[PDB]
Amino acid sequence: RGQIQVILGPMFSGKSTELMRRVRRFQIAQYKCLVIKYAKDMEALPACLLRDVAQEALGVAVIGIDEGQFFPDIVEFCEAMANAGKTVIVAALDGTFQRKPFGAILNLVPLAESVVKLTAVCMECFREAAYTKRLGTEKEVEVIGGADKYHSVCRLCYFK
Amino acid sequence: RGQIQVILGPMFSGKSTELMRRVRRFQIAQYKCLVIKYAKDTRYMEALPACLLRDVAQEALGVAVIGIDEGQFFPDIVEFCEAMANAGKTVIVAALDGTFQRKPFGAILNLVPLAESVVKLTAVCMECFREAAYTKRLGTEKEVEVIGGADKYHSVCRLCYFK
Amino acid sequence: RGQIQVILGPMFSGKSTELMRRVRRFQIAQYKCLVIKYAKDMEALPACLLRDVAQEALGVAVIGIDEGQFFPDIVEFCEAMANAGKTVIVAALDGTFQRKPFGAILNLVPLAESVVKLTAVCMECFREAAYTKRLGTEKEVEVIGGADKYHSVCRLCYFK
Amino acid sequence: RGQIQVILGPMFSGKSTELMRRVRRFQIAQYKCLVIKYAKDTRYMEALPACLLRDVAQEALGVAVIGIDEGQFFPDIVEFCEAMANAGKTVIVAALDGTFQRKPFGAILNLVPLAESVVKLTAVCMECFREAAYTKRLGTEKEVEVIGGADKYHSVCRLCYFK
Ligand SMILES: [Zn+2]
Ligand SMILES: [Zn+2]
Ligand SMILES: [Zn+2]
Ligand SMILES: [Zn+2]
């Protein structure tokens, strides 16, 4: 019996660290694990499309995807793997800097056995944060960056 | 300061109870609460029925804490929740995440990017007795909205869903 | 395979409501449930000692105990039931009005498969609350009461 | 305002990772953090070894956020955490809840009544592959403290624990 777990949150909330905590519990217990990272940001492979790691993923028990929002192919990938009998764990930002859905990641929710959304700390007033604020003027969805270009932010701070 | 909490789950997972437990905590500490139910689901603190949350906007505006039950049925929910939360209110939404076909139910998933907290609850599988994440329709009707209970639907794991 | 789940929290945090949410999921799925309430505050029975409901508990699949802190007998009761193959779910206050362990309830933690501690809302400043404050001067552990005698309180408020 | 978060679990459940994820959130937002490890467990942001948390009291006093790893080994933990939390600090404690015999480990359970949050984590059973809630000692030593890893211990469910 396979499954899909989803780990949502803004930036700076530790989504990857949670994905890995989870994946490692299976590894220290001698399951074959694979962990897939977005090329542009136990086996561990960088990728831009999940097709590039599908045949490899078929040969393991536990799959982790970091930054799932960047993988247009993610919903079909996960559903097939889980139906293949694999444990699939996905870290993905829930929203863009506009607080809109980020890629195809939320269509994973109806298919997932578990869903959680983690918390950051507001970089502007130090309450809990659920959103990511883009600090500059660019308006395209994909702008790779860290605390240089982005602030994890609460609702008040978001709208300042 | 205002916020949106979201409670997802299959049918039979207690989303309404969890919604009432949260709202009641604020009420016993003397907040004004309002719970909104969907008018057309009658299979059984201000409590009010609604068909479009616009119906109850002025009543909502006069309270601290607002619960929305069966939130998948309100096509205006994003706009309503976001506006209330922005005015200072705590908003808590119980809602099914997927239809009988396991596809987004209504507009409810657009609330995720706007929400401070999101949980997904667990039912127990009515066919094998593992944990259940999905709802299966027993009959053959194909329209999305069919009000009903265990008569019409089973809470179901991945395995049983596809049997 | 049986288990023990523990639901801790201060007063006014909905522990009973959570216990029942959990128990009801099993009932609507046609398991025999029993729910045991403290006599002094689906089958539902009031009790002062769990020995009075043990033989009955043997005949069901899912057992709930509300106010487990009041049952001196609780640890042995739960462990035996769970080892009998039953799902045992326990709501219990974690601490007294002095923030000390309340009865034998924390010896359930090492034996429990799951443990959570819920939150109330501070009745004095309206932040989250983890503690119960006794409003009057009595110093005995057991004083049955509601928001008449007690306030759910945060750490600051506790120490005012 | 100060607080005590507690992370329990069997061995192999990631309590340390969860501890670091929480602490790192405060650090990336420019808080001063301190992580304390138990000196005698060397089987591999201020990080410091300790045997009694009194050792590191003055270093602790100069930071916003303090993590305590393997907290079951510090016989002074209640007093330390409660004092720091009362002085304004956020304190987060990873610790095992039970010994190899499933009895309270150290003083750690007395922290529960003082804590704002308590979670118990899950390992995976090393013998049947269900979820694991307990730790079993493979050998026959009977003293409580025996530093070691998968060599000496298995993370285990109720069923396998008693096999
Ligand atoms: Zn802020
Ligand atoms: Zn099933
Ligand atoms: Zn307070
Ligand atoms: Zn096992």
XYZ file of C-alpha atoms and ligand atoms in Angstrom:
650
model
C 0.000 0.000 0.000
C 1.456 3.328 -1.291
C 0.626 6.921 -0.332
C 1.251 10.659 -0.883
C 2.186 13.084 1.930
C 2.319 16.855 1.213
C 4.329 19.442 3.133
C 3.309 23.013 2.288
C 4.436 26.331 3.837
C 6.047 29.606 2.947
C 9.796 30.022 2.358
C 12.129 29.704 5.348
C 9.746 27.244 7.114
C 11.930 24.115 6.905
C 9.936 22.163 4.391
C 13.015 20.294 3.064
C 14.241 19.556 6.537
C 10.802 18.018 7.341
C 10.777 16.048 4.068
C 14.257 14.669 4.927
C 13.330 13.865 8.573
C 10.496 11.815 7.225
C 12.503 10.115 4.442
C 15.425 9.236 6.790
C 13.167 7.336 9.185
C 12.570 4.856 6.341
C 16.221 4.703 5.377
C 17.673 3.875 8.811
C 15.173 1.001 8.613
C 16.681 -0.279 5.361
C 14.250 0.868 2.700
C 15.594 2.065 -0.638
C 15.083 5.856 -0.752
C 15.375 8.438 -3.511
C 15.284 12.218 -2.994
C 14.751 14.563 -5.946
C 15.837 18.256 -5.839
C 15.050 21.055 -8.319
C 18.173 21.371 -10.539
C 17.856 25.152 -10.697
C 17.691 26.229 -7.046
C 20.582 7.050 -0.138
C 20.263 8.331 -3.738
C 19.834 12.106 -4.375
C 19.402 13.509 -7.904
C 18.874 17.034 -9.345
C 16.151 17.393 -12.016
C 14.138 19.895 -14.061
C 11.436 17.436 -15.088
C 10.433 14.248 -13.196
C 10.453 12.139 -16.399
C 14.271 12.293 -16.072
C 14.080 10.274 -12.792
C 10.977 8.105 -13.259
C 12.660 4.778 -14.177
C 15.012 5.243 -11.175
C 12.023 6.068 -8.909
C 10.404 2.783 -10.022
C 13.275 0.918 -8.366
C 12.849 2.259 -4.799
C 10.392 2.194 -1.863
C 10.366 5.862 -0.682
C 10.468 8.974 -2.903
C 10.986 12.578 -1.754
C 10.420 15.651 -3.882
C 11.787 19.047 -2.750
C 10.292 22.162 -4.428
C 7.482 20.234 -6.081
C 5.886 23.509 -7.230
C 8.555 23.766 -9.942
C 7.685 20.413 -11.538
C 4.755 20.838 -13.980
C 4.521 17.060 -14.183
C 4.062 16.440 -10.379
C 0.399 15.280 -9.952
C 0.543 12.380 -12.508
C 4.046 11.498 -11.271
C 2.970 11.128 -7.609
C -0.350 9.416 -8.219
C 1.353 6.745 -10.432
C 4.196 6.181 -7.966
C 1.728 5.827 -5.042
C -0.437 3.511 -7.062
C 2.812 1.588 -7.841
C 2.980 0.986 -4.026
C 5.543 3.680 -3.121
C 5.617 6.226 -0.248
C 5.814 9.656 -1.927
C 6.601 12.721 0.195
C 6.433 16.247 -1.348
C 7.715 19.570 -0.016
C 6.309 22.479 -2.075
C 5.540 26.141 -1.490
C 1.765 26.558 -1.354
C 1.680 30.044 -2.847
C 3.624 32.464 -5.031
C 4.694 35.998 -3.846
C 1.167 36.982 -4.831
C -0.400 34.333 -2.524
C -1.761 32.538 -5.561
C -1.408 28.753 -6.186
C 2.148 27.884 -7.226
C 2.218 25.533 -10.213
C 0.130 22.328 -10.010
C 0.911 21.450 -6.376
C -2.580 21.919 -4.876
C -4.131 19.328 -7.197
C -2.086 16.917 -5.081
C -4.304 17.655 -2.020
C -7.392 15.604 -3.065
C -5.053 12.640 -3.786
C -2.828 12.936 -0.705
C -3.210 10.839 2.433
C -1.735 13.615 4.521
C -1.385 17.353 4.259
C 0.289 19.841 6.598
C 1.330 23.474 6.187
C 4.346 24.656 8.203
C 5.105 28.012 9.701
C 8.086 30.424 9.279
C 8.879 33.425 11.461
C 7.996 36.894 10.255
C 11.218 38.567 9.178
C 9.517 41.958 9.663
C 7.742 41.895 13.099
C 8.577 38.460 14.453
C 5.107 36.856 14.699
C 4.375 33.511 12.860
C 4.453 33.681 9.113
C 2.405 31.934 6.491
C 3.343 33.985 3.390
C 6.288 34.876 1.200
C 6.840 38.577 0.244
C 8.972 39.397 -2.861
C 11.215 42.356 -1.836
C 11.763 43.814 -5.371
C 9.693 44.778 -8.455
C 9.969 41.692 -10.787
C 6.590 40.112 -11.598
C 7.457 36.768 -13.217
C 6.573 33.729 -11.086
C 10.025 32.039 -11.116
C 12.788 34.158 -9.557
C 15.281 31.853 -7.790
C 16.474 33.513 -4.547
C 16.905 33.470 -0.789
C 16.469 36.062 1.959
C 18.177 38.428 -0.535
C 15.001 38.711 -2.688
C 12.308 37.377 -0.305
C 10.855 37.752 3.220
C 8.767 35.181 5.087
C 5.924 37.300 6.377
C 2.678 37.416 8.445
C -0.618 38.860 7.076
C -0.130 42.418 8.487
C 3.460 42.529 7.212
C 2.490 41.088 3.860
C 0.274 44.118 3.200
C 2.761 46.842 4.273
C -5.292 40.361 13.928
C -7.261 38.131 11.523
C -6.601 34.691 10.110
C -7.904 31.768 8.039
C -7.660 28.239 9.417
C -8.725 25.403 7.030
C -9.854 21.893 8.044
C -9.904 19.360 5.167
C -10.661 15.686 5.140
C -12.825 12.983 3.584
C -16.455 12.553 4.684
C -16.818 11.005 8.204
C -13.557 12.480 9.496
C -15.105 14.886 12.062
C -14.354 18.188 10.273
C -17.421 19.807 11.867
C -16.553 18.677 15.364
C -13.006 19.980 14.931
C -14.557 23.196 13.604
C -16.781 23.438 16.766
C -14.017 22.612 19.207
C -11.928 25.482 17.819
C -14.795 27.998 17.755
C -15.999 27.018 21.218
C -12.580 27.830 22.735
C -13.049 31.456 21.698
C -16.632 31.487 22.870
C -16.067 30.273 26.429
C -13.541 33.146 26.680
C -16.365 35.581 25.732
C -15.868 36.269 21.999
C -18.785 36.749 19.626
C -18.917 33.739 17.308
C -20.888 32.923 14.203
C -21.207 29.481 12.602
C -22.449 29.258 8.998
C -23.930 26.036 7.572
C -24.928 25.261 3.995
C -28.712 25.743 3.671
C -29.357 22.719 1.479
C -27.622 20.156 3.666
C -30.257 19.346 6.266
C -29.491 15.784 7.254
C -28.563 16.801 10.863
C -23.445 31.633 19.540
C -25.200 32.804 16.377
C -25.830 29.880 13.926
C -27.103 30.714 10.378
C -27.931 28.880 7.081
C -26.664 30.258 3.805
C -26.434 29.593 0.084
C -23.954 32.321 -0.785
C -21.875 33.730 2.009
C -22.919 37.205 0.744
C -26.288 36.397 2.446
C -24.657 36.656 5.871
C -22.024 39.333 5.298
C -23.635 41.927 7.665
C -24.088 39.379 10.468
C -20.467 38.233 9.929
C -19.243 41.846 10.189
C -20.512 42.097 13.751
C -18.601 39.195 15.298
C -15.025 38.293 16.229
C -14.908 34.612 15.066
C -16.636 32.956 12.069
C -16.885 29.204 11.303
C -17.881 27.976 7.869
C -19.151 24.426 7.711
C -19.227 22.425 4.399
C -17.208 25.222 2.765
C -16.896 23.389 -0.543
C -20.462 24.402 -1.358
C -19.832 28.194 -1.313
C -18.546 29.436 -4.693
C -17.684 32.818 -3.058
C -15.557 31.505 -0.142
C -12.094 32.846 -1.082
C -13.337 36.408 -1.360
C -15.483 36.207 1.743
C -12.723 34.694 3.960
C -10.004 36.936 2.681
C -12.131 40.084 3.278
C -13.205 39.083 6.817
C -9.692 38.010 7.821
C -8.387 41.341 6.500
C -10.932 43.156 8.725
C -9.617 41.485 11.915
C -11.793 38.323 12.166
C -10.659 34.754 12.835
C -12.146 32.514 10.105
C -12.220 28.722 10.388
C -13.373 26.551 7.466
C -14.341 22.895 7.547
C -14.530 21.534 3.994
C -14.002 18.445 1.897
C -10.865 18.681 -0.237
C -11.977 16.245 -2.968
C -15.177 15.118 -4.714
C -16.227 11.443 -5.036
C -13.772 11.489 -7.993
C -10.924 12.921 -5.942
C -10.757 16.245 -7.719
C -10.816 19.703 -6.109
C -14.273 20.428 -4.653
C -15.350 23.941 -5.403
C -13.012 26.876 -4.903
C -11.850 25.563 -1.597
C -8.219 24.876 -2.561
C -7.611 28.525 -3.444
C -7.937 29.194 0.276
C -4.709 27.278 0.949
C -2.329 30.065 -0.263
C -4.317 32.557 1.918
C -4.421 30.436 5.066
C -2.270 30.589 8.214
C -3.087 26.903 8.989
C -4.133 23.866 6.931
C -4.802 20.385 8.245
C -6.197 17.274 6.582
C -8.190 14.915 8.774
C -8.548 11.139 8.615
C -11.640 8.972 8.503
C -11.601 5.186 9.007
C -12.044 3.023 5.926
C -15.557 1.604 5.835
C -14.359 -1.389 3.748
C -10.973 -2.562 5.137
C -10.680 -0.519 8.365
C -7.345 1.251 7.669
C -7.250 5.057 7.815
C -9.348 6.694 5.093
C -8.316 9.696 3.040
C -10.960 9.614 0.309
C -14.744 9.490 -0.238
C -16.313 6.945 -2.700
C -19.892 7.338 -4.090
C -21.745 3.997 -3.801
C -24.303 4.604 -6.596
C -23.720 5.853 -10.170
C -24.913 9.481 -10.180
C -22.303 11.689 -11.820
C -23.249 15.248 -10.917
C -20.899 16.704 -8.317
C -23.581 17.757 -5.707
C -25.589 14.958 -4.161
C -26.415 15.613 -0.492
C -26.285 12.349 1.529
C -24.599 10.276 4.236
C -23.294 6.742 4.726
C -26.362 5.710 2.643
C -24.758 7.217 -0.464
C -21.012 7.432 0.367
C -18.148 5.446 1.979
C -15.031 6.886 3.586
C -12.216 5.035 1.967
C -8.419 4.406 1.718
C -6.488 4.370 -1.626
C -6.767 0.590 -1.900
C -10.537 0.375 -1.358
C -11.206 3.466 -3.445
C -10.083 1.596 -6.547
C -11.497 -1.931 -5.754
C -2.990 -4.577 17.019
C -4.095 -2.255 19.892
C -2.826 1.193 20.902
C -3.035 4.151 23.328
C -3.594 7.769 22.205
C -3.315 10.612 24.773
C -4.951 14.030 24.534
C -3.555 16.504 27.071
C -4.242 20.249 27.498
C -5.494 22.752 30.006
C -9.187 23.231 30.846
C -11.444 24.776 28.198
C -9.304 23.330 25.339
C -11.839 20.819 23.970
C -10.165 17.633 25.046
C -13.479 15.716 25.314
C -14.670 17.027 22.001
C -11.406 15.743 20.407
C -11.714 12.377 22.187
C -15.299 12.052 20.851
C -14.354 13.150 17.287
C -11.820 10.388 17.288
C -14.097 7.737 18.854
C -17.024 8.543 16.485
C -14.923 7.909 13.382
C -14.708 4.267 14.512
C -18.382 4.059 15.375
C -19.807 5.300 12.056
C -17.663 2.472 10.659
C -19.412 -0.122 12.827
C -16.952 -0.805 15.617
C -18.256 -1.362 19.135
C -17.316 1.736 21.176
C -17.398 2.533 24.881
C -16.856 5.995 26.391
C -16.152 6.396 30.111
C -16.802 9.708 31.965
C -15.779 10.709 35.507
C -18.914 10.188 37.671
C -18.170 13.277 39.751
C -17.765 16.059 37.180
C -22.619 3.698 21.445
C -22.270 2.886 25.177
C -21.431 5.709 27.661
C -20.954 5.024 31.390
C -20.071 7.208 34.429
C -17.412 5.817 36.811
C -15.192 6.650 39.790
C -12.825 3.723 39.309
C -12.135 1.882 36.010
C -12.500 -1.561 37.660
C -16.262 -0.822 37.582
C -16.200 -0.860 33.726
C -13.383 -3.298 32.905
C -15.466 -6.400 32.023
C -17.652 -4.183 29.771
C -14.517 -2.655 28.164
C -13.323 -6.203 27.365
C -16.334 -6.598 25.077
C -15.642 -3.665 22.705
C -13.116 -2.484 20.082
C -12.630 1.235 20.968
C -12.444 2.737 24.480
C -12.508 6.447 25.378
C -11.661 7.888 28.769
C -12.591 11.511 29.602
C -10.803 13.112 32.599
C -8.287 10.299 32.926
C -6.362 12.299 35.551
C -9.071 11.421 38.089
C -8.643 7.652 37.691
C -5.764 6.413 39.906
C -5.973 3.076 38.118
C -5.467 4.465 34.530
C -1.950 3.281 33.447
C -2.508 -0.484 34.136
C -6.047 -0.189 32.735
C -4.904 1.267 29.378
C -1.825 -0.881 28.907
C -3.894 -4.096 29.473
C -6.702 -2.972 27.164
C -4.198 -2.044 24.401
C -2.381 -5.302 24.861
C -5.852 -6.961 24.637
C -5.965 -5.480 21.068
C -8.171 -2.432 21.770
C -7.859 1.221 20.632
C -7.714 3.284 23.848
C -8.075 7.072 23.644
C -7.552 9.245 26.782
C -8.400 12.899 27.403
C -6.735 14.140 30.623
C -5.532 17.460 31.992
C -1.732 17.450 31.970
C -1.294 19.624 35.046
C -3.016 20.771 38.229
C -3.634 24.504 39.077
C -0.051 24.423 40.316
C 1.275 23.190 36.922
C 2.322 19.941 38.547
C 1.516 16.447 37.135
C -2.148 15.582 37.690
C -2.584 12.050 39.031
C -0.873 9.197 37.133
C -1.633 10.423 33.596
C 1.936 11.194 32.442
C 3.103 7.618 33.038
C 0.863 6.902 30.047
C 3.248 8.856 27.739
C 6.045 6.222 27.473
C 3.358 3.604 26.632
C 1.282 5.704 24.221
C 1.522 5.505 20.441
C 0.444 9.109 20.138
C 0.518 12.184 22.307
C -0.782 15.696 21.647
C -1.411 18.684 23.911
C -4.205 21.076 22.896
C -4.525 24.784 23.374
C -7.220 26.955 25.078
C -7.592 30.720 24.790
C -6.356 32.937 27.587
C -9.396 34.169 29.478
C -7.302 37.100 30.762
C -5.436 38.620 27.733
C -6.617 36.503 24.825
C -3.348 34.871 23.674
C -3.065 30.998 23.493
C -3.244 29.214 26.788
C -1.496 26.140 28.061
C -2.292 26.384 31.804
C -5.184 26.345 34.233
C -5.336 29.053 36.983
C -7.458 28.388 40.131
C -9.312 31.686 40.857
C -9.803 31.157 44.652
C -7.736 30.141 47.721
C -8.440 26.350 48.128
C -5.292 24.202 47.897
C -6.590 20.629 47.579
C -5.994 19.051 44.157
C -9.616 18.000 43.419
C -12.066 20.920 43.271
C -14.749 20.167 40.647
C -15.638 23.389 38.771
C -15.950 25.346 35.549
C -15.130 28.915 34.525
C -16.635 29.829 37.937
C -13.518 28.589 39.822
C -10.921 28.381 37.007
C -9.322 30.355 34.140
C -7.484 28.900 31.147
C -4.376 31.036 31.047
C -1.074 31.832 29.234
C 2.320 31.969 31.045
C 2.291 35.773 31.695
C -1.301 35.620 32.958
C -0.613 32.553 35.049
C 1.915 34.526 37.109
C -0.206 37.678 37.680
C 7.355 36.248 25.811
C 8.975 32.887 26.652
C 7.879 29.314 26.102
C 8.770 25.615 26.320
C 8.166 23.363 23.324
C 8.820 19.600 23.864
C 9.570 17.018 21.145
C 9.236 13.376 22.294
C 9.563 10.158 20.392
C 11.352 6.813 20.255
C 14.941 6.600 18.976
C 15.237 7.066 15.153
C 12.211 9.359 14.915
C 14.107 12.549 13.915
C 13.683 14.510 17.178
C 16.966 16.355 16.553
C 16.087 17.306 13.006
C 12.701 18.595 14.164
C 14.569 20.458 16.913
C 16.906 22.042 14.262
C 14.145 22.922 11.836
C 12.357 24.878 14.574
C 15.491 26.649 15.838
C 16.685 27.471 12.331
C 13.432 29.338 11.563
C 14.281 31.822 14.310
C 17.881 32.043 13.209
C 17.295 32.919 9.555
C 15.125 35.776 10.908
C 18.178 37.025 12.887
C 17.644 35.735 16.452
C 20.519 34.580 18.636
C 20.230 30.813 19.057
C 21.992 28.288 21.227
C 21.862 24.505 20.806
C 22.953 22.308 23.733
C 24.007 18.668 23.238
C 24.793 16.046 25.864
C 28.595 15.852 26.270
C 28.817 12.080 26.559
C 26.871 11.236 23.419
C 29.477 11.591 20.692
C 28.339 9.169 18.030
C 27.650 12.005 15.498
C 24.555 29.661 15.913
C 26.329 28.816 19.168
C 26.540 24.996 19.731
C 27.786 23.722 23.156
C 28.291 20.366 25.000
C 27.085 19.987 28.556
C 26.661 17.524 31.401
C 24.484 19.673 33.636
C 22.672 22.552 32.042
C 24.068 24.725 34.887
C 27.375 24.533 32.906
C 25.896 26.712 30.163
C 23.571 28.988 32.121
C 25.545 32.227 31.387
C 25.792 31.464 27.657
C 22.047 30.630 27.642
C 21.256 33.969 29.328
C 22.660 35.878 26.371
C 20.478 34.437 23.609
C 16.854 34.565 22.461
C 16.277 30.855 21.555
C 17.705 27.702 23.206
C 17.497 24.095 21.913
C 18.234 21.163 24.183
C 19.081 17.925 22.441
C 18.820 14.506 24.236
C 17.084 16.264 27.145
C 16.457 13.035 29.036
C 20.088 13.062 30.143
C 19.900 16.374 32.085
C 18.657 15.828 35.660
C 18.243 19.640 36.039
C 16.075 20.280 32.934
C 12.760 21.329 34.543
C 14.395 24.063 36.583
C 16.603 25.252 33.756
C 13.759 25.432 31.167
C 11.277 26.984 33.507
C 13.769 29.719 34.557
C 14.835 30.576 30.977
C 11.256 30.590 29.676
C 10.301 32.882 32.571
C 13.108 35.279 31.526
C 11.713 35.662 27.975
C 13.518 32.861 26.055
C 12.003 30.310 23.674
C 13.134 26.828 24.802
C 12.780 23.749 22.596
C 13.581 20.264 23.935
C 14.125 17.095 21.944
C 14.041 14.081 24.272
C 13.094 10.437 24.485
C 9.938 9.895 26.534
C 10.674 6.288 27.574
C 13.665 4.061 28.381
C 14.275 0.657 26.722
C 11.747 -0.551 29.354
C 9.150 2.052 28.432
C 9.310 3.971 31.676
C 9.818 7.729 32.086
C 13.380 8.700 31.104
C 14.830 11.168 33.528
C 12.862 14.184 34.694
C 11.664 14.914 31.225
C 7.949 14.251 31.810
C 7.736 16.959 34.473
C 8.257 19.413 31.626
C 4.853 18.507 30.164
C 2.772 20.518 32.718
C 5.102 23.530 32.078
C 5.063 23.348 28.285
C 3.046 25.353 25.741
C 3.459 22.534 23.146
C 4.081 18.773 23.302
C 4.387 16.423 20.356
C 5.361 12.765 20.124
C 7.139 11.669 16.965
C 7.055 8.343 15.137
C 9.872 6.092 14.013
C 9.414 3.146 11.624
C 9.505 -0.333 13.126
C 12.827 -1.988 12.357
C 11.227 -5.468 12.633
C 7.775 -5.354 10.947
C 7.822 -1.919 9.253
C 4.693 -0.394 10.871
C 5.041 2.920 12.718
C 7.224 2.660 15.825
C 6.479 4.262 19.166
C 9.007 2.476 21.374
C 12.732 1.652 21.656
C 13.918 -1.959 22.395
C 17.471 -2.757 23.672
C 18.937 -5.654 21.637
C 21.456 -6.879 24.259
C 20.906 -7.601 27.980
C 22.507 -4.666 29.827
C 20.117 -3.342 32.456
C 21.494 0.035 33.494
C 19.412 2.884 32.098
C 22.280 4.819 30.325
C 24.002 3.013 27.490
C 25.016 5.372 24.664
C 24.577 3.664 21.252
C 22.751 3.500 17.919
C 21.064 0.906 15.714
C 23.925 -1.399 16.864
C 22.405 -1.544 20.352
C 18.738 -0.500 19.872
C 15.718 -1.022 17.559
C 12.841 1.389 17.030
C 9.780 -0.695 17.547
C 5.930 -0.920 17.558
C 3.901 -2.458 20.461
C 3.735 -5.838 18.731
C 7.470 -6.173 18.036
C 8.423 -4.707 21.397
C 6.994 -7.769 23.120
C 8.017 -10.513 20.571
Zn 4.869 40.412 10.699
Zn -9.715 0.320 2.800
Zn -2.832 35.791 28.926
Zn 6.782 -3.974 14.477
